[PDB]
Design a protein around this ligand. Structure first.
Ligand SMILES: NC(=O)C1=CN([C@@H]2O[C@H](COP(=O)(O)OP(=O)(O)OC[C@H]3O[C@@H](n4cnc5c(N)ncnc54)[C@H](OP(=O)(O)O)[C@@H]3O)[C@@H](O)[C@H]2O)C=CC1
Ligand SMILES: NC(=O)C1=CN([C@@H]2O[C@H](COP(=O)(O)OP(=O)(O)OC[C@H]3O[C@@H](n4cnc5c(N)ncnc54)[C@H](OP(=O)(O)O)[C@@H]3O)[C@@H](O)[C@H]2O)C=CC1
Lengths: 678, 678, 60
């Protein structure tokens, strides 16, 4: 039974030597994959000259609405994905993570792209960097999306999540993707890709799929291409030395497997609930997804006087875990994905038993069983620093060693001795122990969860990579970071420092800068609707003379009787020289000047971006406000009844009779639109 | 004459096969370089166990003050550097760039580390990411400095600048460096390192130097090391495939050669002032540092109807360029650094002459003169898109080809056909031309300068890499980014997404988060000095009932007669339902509640970080304000007379009788210190 | 109290002045007809103000 490959818009398939997909819980082959003969250069050609100008022509707000639409369309028909994911040996609660974490990553990147990205093709990430004394030469950093493809090489752990945690930053960063899934569970990936393609939501060529060996793709990559890897270290270290990737100098982001620690502190005693949540977290982490998630706990570091208590608690908790078929009742842990994975886990357990010990049923696994089963294994290492096989050989299953420490300074060295880790955990209650742990063991870990009683109530866990936290550690974990919020879409964008005059940067960035030319057109910018505002629509307000009675009435009305405003003696001894007008009264009389009192398109204010009071305002000191538009960034009208609107940001520039700027800031504003989209 | 390498605290030298440094303007060899027999593992060992804990014990404010001290120590004895830089064949105006830009990089990173970095070892770059609905599981990203060495491999262009543009982010990001300068001009780098070491400012082991070949340094690097490269692409691709850099997965950052465009627009005619500044910029860029800078203009793209005018202006401007000795008067261009570099330039000129054309003195260059001179060369290519050797071969000297374009669409293709560049320039006056040029050609460049009449008055130039702009382009230009402001010190840090309860993240980050435990201690936080404030010192202010008279008095006093506050009919039709209290009046009455009226340590406010109005405050709705400290981040008392102080940031959180957060924001405050330091 | 106020400013009469000197600014006594009303649109406090509005182009 062929498993196809969505290349060049057509569900193609290969003609040649074929690998085949085994069923995990029973053992038969019900798919078989091949990609021999598929033209990969033509696939990249179609994705670059058909899908990339269709994604790069969209704005970021439309590319976030596309991710939200694909998230809803893939959340609707989610029950045809659990049936494909049960072929991988996962349970219902272990495939729930795989499906809903990817779809929640899609919703999360939709929310981030709707909230913190502009209605533009370019993306100015800085405010402004002035490079001149007069103000005729400045520079700001732009982020233009690359004009190539993203070659994502996933793994067999998360077909749904592991693609969709790389696909939403790719599509939000304006690039078409070519996903190469693992040939062990490519069927769920093709289910996801087919549900994406057969909806009309994404453009053509914006996604591809090679269920099978690529072979000729990495040899045909342009310098604007990015490659993201997730798998073993030994394969990804052969793909980094691939001659085209180093010749064209394309970004190669690698995520490998690591030895994730879980350090128990000296302050935790077995009468505390910290011990109970420690044992619960270690067991749930090691038994979720049969221990096959990349962020699974594989080194439990305990105090020396608590080895027996932790060991007895882990024995008494792990023997309730039932290995079997996931569909039948009373079975918590599912199975592995292949018999080759069972052989690999057992031959890593044998290497760990070449210098370790044993606490439970370990390497005993029936290699002729109809199904890739493996019992939950808890090892032991009595000499943790004198054994380099524990800190170097991972067992990619339900296996995790246990080893003692010496009073929270040997535990730091044992947590750092993994050579870089993908995740970690400290379970304490004293916060100074957590300070000393992050101050020395965050150099090697990519994501540390400090776990206590207050955190363990609504914790997402240790093996749930959040869609807004950095997923990736240094060294053995690969170095390449993923999912860092909006740090993930910046791997798909070239960061260009565009210099020039500010009146040029205002037209390049479609914003207003600091000293750009303005368009004063005799009416009030708060009377304009959204679609007739341009960034640069200024307003030169009338003046208002600040006086002593202004200081008195504002300090009376608010209550701010600070000595630099009310007292006369101490104001003559302060840094100013005399009594000054309140900063908040300058901020308030500004909005007294520029705000239209009438009923207009401006709905609410709710915002004040970045306020700095530069020079003081004295009595007998006029104030003149320069209200000018800076951003438009419309919203997508989430219902059909709601009013169409868009967050317009005005850059406010107060100054005085000498034209020197006091109190320059920026306010957000919700201006209603003239024409909606529903 | 030996060139002493600074390894393990001692000025050692090699014993064996050696290279040597020719005097570039005369021809004799007045140094000779070797590093054979030097223990390379002991250098990294001494650096990691001596200077790395001494740098990682300092705060970021102290590591910025150290950079300012090294800058003031090296700016004083700057005249012993021009004598060594005249040996490179560079002029006084070129060595002025090489020295003063390298020291202004130190001053710039000092002024960035003393303004935007905390008084701490761990730097949380985010605000906060809430991950729970109840508010007991949040996370934030910590940036901890790496615990290894930063091996810098420079080139022969900028011995002073190219080291110090890699050494100031390394020291500001808490790592010791092992600078490997090029053996063509390593003597200026040894002068810099000797002036740094003989000052007592940096710790021992916090800087090293290998004058000669590295040999066995890249084979000893741990996974917590980084490598930064600058030089040819052919060497840097051999260093990326080095079997330890890919084994330990250490960050290799590469900067290579490029083909920098300089596009002239259709709006520029020879009667405009844009044409003369175009010719001046091209000539000054091609003749500064004898064309031996990495950001030099090497492809001049002009429209087809202006090729004769541009060529007759460039030749008439370049015949005045005097090539000779820099010390004698009337000489503008210096010389190349080696006769080997002269042969390497002319062998690329012959490749460009194998398919191009000629306008000036090109391949005519005396390969027998006592001095590495090379004449200014302006080439020509009549068929730019049919000749791939122009867009693939760079001559690393005064050579810059010229080629025609066809109406701002062939110009974009010829600017993007460089395979990725390092810098660029569009000279226009129409900003909608610059919008298209940045939209289509910032994918391949790294720093574009849109030059016009207002920009060229105070422009730093095309070949001036600013210490707060990203220096580095994609593809052929390496890919790795440098000098990006604080984007450079993040290559030397590990980004750790630390999870846990907010009261734990308050103690890890030494800040306050959102829901941490507070320290209410019966007196007022504005009465405490700087040295007795802790982040968490809170204050629960008395209440104030927002009545209907408050809205009216504030709308009268400010002048903000907005319809949601002063109109009863229109506010019944708006989104709120009725009249609401002004947001700025909630902001002002908050400061009425928490500010002490007395004379205390609090000097000035001057700031407000991020204000968001969540829910509207209505009439008959009380207001209670929760002032609590967030950051301390002291200042270094730049004089001896000035008052010691520190920018304490409070986290203000207004709420009402339902205890829901209205109007949560954050104010800056310049709180005085009890004890000074300088 | 609790009764809104809306003002209908409208021009009524222009009647320029003759600029008795050569230095003085050209101007005219424009009379406006202010008509305040409330939410029921009944006219409270209707009156008329004089105003010395400056001219664009003088004559003498
Ligand atoms: N996220 C993690 O931390 C992961 C860790 N692992 C580690 O991986 C080990 C083995 O799992 P394995 O499946 O062998 O991982 P692989 O070594 O097979 O690499 C995984 C991915 O790379 C692809 N791949 C392999 N060779 C090439 C190539 N030459 N060119 C392009 N793509 C290629 C594979 O496709 P194909 O299937 O066709 O080879 C698969 O999609 C396990 O023992 C475990 O330690 C497993 C999964 C991920
Ligand atoms: N930034 C840029 O764009 C630059 C471009 N160039 C290009 O470089 C070409 C010539 O400069 P070149 O001298 O060849 O620069 P190299 O390619 O020789 O390498 C330059 C630096 O790398 C060092 N290096 C060389 N081999 C190794 C190695 N195996 N391990 C570690 N370090 C090593 C060199 O040391 P040693 O000097 O002892 O070899 C020097 O410090 C020019 O033609 C020009 O195209 C020149 C300067 C910089």
């Amino acid at each position: 039974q062929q498993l196809a490959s969505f290349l060049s818009g057509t569900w193609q398939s290969g003609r040649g030597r074929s690998r085949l997909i085994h069923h995990a819980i029973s053992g038969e082959a019900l798919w078989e994959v091949t990609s021999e003969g598929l033209d990969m250069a033509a696939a990249r050609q179609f994705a670059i000259e058909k899908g990339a100008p269709a994604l790069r022509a969209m704005t970021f707000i439309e590319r976030a609405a596309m991710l939200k639409a694909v998230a809803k369309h893939l959340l609707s028909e989610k029950e045809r994905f659990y049936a494909l994911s049960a072929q991988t040996g996962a349970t219902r609660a272990d495939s729930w993570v795989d499906i809903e974490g990817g779809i929640g990553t899609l919703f999360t990147y939709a929310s981030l792209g709707s909230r913190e990205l502009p209605d533009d093709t370019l993306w100015p990430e800085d405010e402004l960097i002035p490079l001149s004394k007069e103000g005729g030469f400045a520079a700001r950093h732009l982020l233009t999306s690359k004009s190539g493809v993203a070659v994502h090489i996933n793994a067999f752990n998360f077909p749904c999540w592991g693609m969709l945690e790389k696909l939403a930053p790719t599509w939000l960063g304006g690039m078409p993707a070519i996903i190469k899934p693992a040939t062990a569970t490519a069927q769920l990936t093709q289910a996801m890709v087919k549900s994406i393609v057969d909806s009309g939501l994404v453009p053509e060529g914006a996604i591809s799929l090679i269920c099978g060996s690529a072979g000729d793709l990495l040899d045909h990559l342009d310098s604007q291409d990015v490659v993201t890897f997730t798998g073993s270290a030994a394969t990804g270290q052969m793909l980094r030395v691939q001659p085209n990737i180093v010749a064209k100098s394309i970004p190669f982001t690698m995520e490998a497997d690591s030895l994730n620690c879980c350090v128990l502190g000296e302050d935790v005693t077995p009468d505390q609930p910290e011990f109970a949540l420690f044992i619960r977290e270690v067991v749930r982490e090691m038994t979720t997804k049969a221990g096959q998630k990349c962020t699974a706990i594989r080194r439990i570091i305990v105090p020396q006087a608590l080895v027996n208590a932790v060991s007895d608690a882990l024995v008494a908790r792990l023997q309730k875990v039932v290995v079997g078929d996931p569909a039948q009742e009373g079975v918590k842990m599912g199975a592995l994905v292949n018999a080759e994975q069972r052989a690999d886990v057992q031959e890593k357990v044998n290497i760990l038993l070449a210098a370790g010990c044993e606490i439970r049923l370990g390497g005993q696994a029936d290699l002729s069983a109809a199904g890739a089963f493996f019992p939950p294994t808890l090892l032991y290492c009595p000499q943790p620093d004198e054994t380099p096989a524990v800190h170097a050989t991972e067992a990619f299953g339900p296996v995790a060693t246990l080893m003692p420490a010496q009073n929270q300074r040997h535990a730091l060295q044992l947590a750092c001795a993994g050579g870089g880790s993908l995740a970690g955990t400290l379970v304490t209650a004293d916060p100074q122990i957590a300070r000393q742990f992050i101050a020395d063991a965050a150099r090697t870990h990519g994501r540390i969860q400090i776990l206590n009683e207050e955190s363990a109530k609504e914790s997402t866990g240790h093996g749930s990579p959040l869609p807004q936290l950095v997923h990736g550690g240094p060294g053995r974990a690969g170095g390449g970071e993923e999912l860092g919020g909006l740090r993930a879409v910046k791997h798909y964008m070239q960061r260009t420092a565009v210099q020039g005059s500010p009146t040029m940067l205002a037209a390049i960035s479609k914003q207003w800068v600091r000293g750009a030319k303005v368009e004063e057109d005799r009416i009030h910018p708060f009377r304009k609707y959204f679609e007739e505002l341009q960034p640069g629509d200024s307003l030169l307000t009338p003046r208002r003379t600040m006086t002593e009675a202004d200081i008195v009435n504002f300090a009376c009305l608010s209550g701010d009787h600070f000595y630099a405003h009310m007292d006369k003696i101490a104001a003559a001894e302060s840094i100013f020289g005399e009594r000054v007008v309140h900063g908040y009264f300058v901020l308030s009389a500004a909005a007294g000047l520029f705000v239209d009192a009438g009923v207009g398109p401006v709905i609410a204010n709710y915002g004040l971006e970045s306020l700095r009071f530069i020079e003081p305002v004295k009595p007998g000191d006029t104030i003149q406000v320069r209200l000018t538009c800076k951003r438009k960034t419309l919203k997508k009208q989430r219902s059909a009844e709601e009013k169409p609107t868009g967050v317009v940001e005005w850059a406010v520039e107060v100054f005085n009779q000498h034209q020197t700027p006091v109190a320059l800031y920026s306010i957000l504003t919700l201006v209603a639109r003239q024409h909606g989209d529903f």
